């Protein structure tokens, strides 16, 4: 499950709503730990 918001909500350009800023709980080198990771996705790669 990925938690997303708009990358640049203050935008009227054609890119408004095209890039989303999402957070993950990722695995890491050790099995006992998780990473909180922020990354950008294009709208077409995610589904609500």
């Amino acid at each position, epitope marked *: 499950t990925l938690q997303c918001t708009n990358y640049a*909500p*203050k935008l*009227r*350009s*054609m890119m408004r709503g095209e890039i989303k800023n999402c957070s993950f709980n990722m695995t890491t080198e050790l099995r006992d730990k998780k990473q909180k990771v922020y990354s950008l996705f294009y709208r077409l790669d995610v589904v609500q």
Partner: antibody
Amino acid sequence: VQLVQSGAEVKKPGASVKVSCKASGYTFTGYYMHWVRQAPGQGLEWMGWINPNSGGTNYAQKFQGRVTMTRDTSISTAYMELSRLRSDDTAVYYCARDRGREWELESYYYYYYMDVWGKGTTVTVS
Amino acid sequence: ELTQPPSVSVSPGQTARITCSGDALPKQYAYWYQQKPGQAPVLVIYKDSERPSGIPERFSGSSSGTTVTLTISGVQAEDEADYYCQSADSSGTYVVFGGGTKLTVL
């Protein structure tokens, strides 16, 4: 560039004044003309704007129906007519021009900025 | 819809931190203006943080959440002014301003 406004007027309540704003140094059309009020001791109150090309307007709810905005492109001039004046309306009335369209390709966006300002027209009601 | 402090103060050379806040801000840009007695206000910062060339390096902005900030580093006596935040309502159809914050240099 320059925005040239009409001079000061002093009126009694129920009266009206006209605040002109003439463009010089840039094309009159293609930008919106905004009006901002500043009563003595107060901050900046947006009143509304007029599209110098189409004649269309956008008013703050406080002025819609009290203030008439017009224009005449043949003289590159915007106007704001203030009617039904009250003593509450003593203020300096400023005209301003925003930035042009921000084209990405075939788009507009209309982000709003002022910066091109007239010096303001003083309107006193009493 | 925009609220900012009535005043701030710095000694000359100190940083001013002038804030403005409101509900529509997370989705709308703020613009900041410097007004002195006798003149129409002049923009200092646009699109929250950008400085439009003719404005010196002492000025910059930033934003987060519902709060937008104007910071002036190295504030000098010539920077005593009423600073205003400008934005728009949530619809983007009406332009709004804060009441203005007086920055005095002591």
